[PDB]
Amino acid sequence: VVKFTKSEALHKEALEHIVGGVNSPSRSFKAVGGGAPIAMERGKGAYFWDVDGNKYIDYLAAYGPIITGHAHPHITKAITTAAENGVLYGTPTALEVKFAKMLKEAMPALDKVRFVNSGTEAVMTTIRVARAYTGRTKIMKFAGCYHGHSDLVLVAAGSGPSTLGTPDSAGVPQSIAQEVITVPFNNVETLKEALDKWGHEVAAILVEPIVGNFGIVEPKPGFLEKVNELVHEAGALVIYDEVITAFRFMYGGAQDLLGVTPDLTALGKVIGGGLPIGAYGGKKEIMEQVAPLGPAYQAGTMAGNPASMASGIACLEVLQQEGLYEKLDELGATLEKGILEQAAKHNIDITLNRLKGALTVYFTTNTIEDYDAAQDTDGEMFGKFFKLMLQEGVNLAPSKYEAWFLTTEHTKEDIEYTIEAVGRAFAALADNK
């Protein structure tokens, strides 16, 4: 039996100074039955150590950014050098141009780019830019997809077919929600309906080209192609939110992987090497709306800072290695196979979506192709599974809507232990109900 005594004490103290003891609700254990979240003291490659000295194989990847593992020495070197020369200037630098060019080389549809401080800021910006460019106000998005924590993307459907949004957070006015139309991911019919109905007032649609925010869910064949067709027909723009997808599945974005081109792209997470970052980019004429060139305002005190540029560069230099994404795919396939075998063995009902080195285990018999179905999977089962996995020394994200991410540092043996641990986790579930 593992113990979490120090984490418990830390959480108790955290509650006094930080709202709910966490700086993101995602980090709370509320969704998985409560209790103190586990506090980590150190990460190295595939491993975490908590404040009680327990070791974990980590699949959280800090919710998407981590792919070179914790503290990869090539990135650490770059960060150290950056700190030694000052991490923040408020002026142009060579590194900004270098990193901009490297992103353009990997994702040839970016004609120009701008750096911001987060995926949230990147998305906020693409929206303002699409509105400035088209002269339109409304924004479309797919149900359940996450585009950061700005007011506009904190809106839900939509009572009835193709309707105006309702607020999905307190503090978000109906005046904001009124500008957003939400429709189901992977559904051509409803997309058609909404565009026929509102298409002429829609500045842009937001798309996770591959979904990572209600588990990993791939677009069906023809879907992204149809989004482009329908949205362009309507005079609207397509914004790919690639904050998760870019550099996660190949050296490049899902747009390069799947061969479908948006008008604008939002980036973040992986491209910072672990440091805070965002970027957006796309077709020349669209980007030229941004000040000082155009009238659309975007700024940010830490935007393009030398530390994040340096660590981002270092990270992509690592990801350039030949055979790297193929290894993630291989290990992912091994992991998928093993989890499915353990589920069959122990009569646990699961569905598993994997693309390369990212996967989600759902507790259900339904194949998950949209948010509605992910919502209806067994969160109570998932919660118990999550806590049993901790006991096995495997750190997952504490939500049924999260992905397991492999890194370049996970080994065959890491995966084989993980499978063993899942086997023991599933056995325990079987013995309780």
Next chain:
Amino acid sequence: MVVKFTKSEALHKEALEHIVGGVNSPSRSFKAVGGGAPIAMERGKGAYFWDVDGNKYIDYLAAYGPIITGHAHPHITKAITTAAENGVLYGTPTALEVKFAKMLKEAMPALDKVRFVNSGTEAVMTTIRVARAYTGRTKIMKFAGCYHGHSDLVLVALGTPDSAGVPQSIAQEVITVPFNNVETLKEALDKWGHEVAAILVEPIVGNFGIVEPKPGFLEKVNELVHEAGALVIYDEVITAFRFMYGGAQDLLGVTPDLTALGKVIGGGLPIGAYGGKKEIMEQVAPLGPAYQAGTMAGNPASMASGIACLEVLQQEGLYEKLDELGATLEKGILEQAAKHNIDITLNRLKGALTVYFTTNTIEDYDAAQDTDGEMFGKFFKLMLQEGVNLAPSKYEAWFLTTEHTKEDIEYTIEAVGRAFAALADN
């Protein structure tokens, strides 16, 4: 002439092809000062910058506000390195978040609880959401010319926006009134007070130059706003830890309901935070229904960096020294203006100041906007030639750091005299 920018010019030419307008903030373009390629910096150490052409500068930009320990202060550098070696981003709680949270609360006792985010802009937009959740109201009030980040609502000039791409539905939620003016404030709250969730205030303005609130003005803001049932948000993204070890609220002794923070408190790394009265903060998930998140929020690098920075700022005599040096600088600049017959007014608080080209006392945005931008731009470019790097706008502040010396100040004063001579010569 003597100071050449060939390499900054070639780099800007390349940047233009890849980055919109060649900069990642419009602040960094030389657009406000007559145009041209901005100076690209290669490294910073203490009070000094070196550009890509090898030219050395005494820096007053402070990266528009966060820099106060100078560039690459060793105490911060070691923290950032240690953090990188131990992993910079976890996505779980850590002991460092709790430690830094306590330090902020210790410096600024009106924070019952705090949350970390990734930028001042995020901290500001969150305080608005929280204010709206708490009061159940939608309108936000702010002062003309003040800057609160680059989220839609605060980019509005009912009101009407000044950024393209910001819808009328947003502008209708914003009311804007002149800074330092009690009558227009009362008048706005009388009409719209019952729909106003909060007012946003830079308790000491930094964004149309440095401008202090008139005597009694902040207390009047609290008085009129609270009686309308609205909350007061201090946007202390610039002010906190700039003027004393604590916020403008601690310095001026006036307490808001919510506070947004950033810039200084990250030691240079990207950061924001917000906090305030316990009951209000209870709205934030997972405690309440007001959502706020952020993948790098509370990251161990930014936490360790912030802690290291506040540790430097705890040293006895540090803020006094910044004040004393600021006084010397102000005194020298005023003497040079008198000597060369240049019309300026100078607003200083502690180690931050703005030189305005005008004869008017500057107390609000309207006045600042009227000052002579042409003369500022010439002055700015003459200063570069003297090896002094300022922020390229008349709306900017000069910021001292712990690393600027009496000799740096003396040199800057003589640089200013040389530049004022050239302005007078014409």
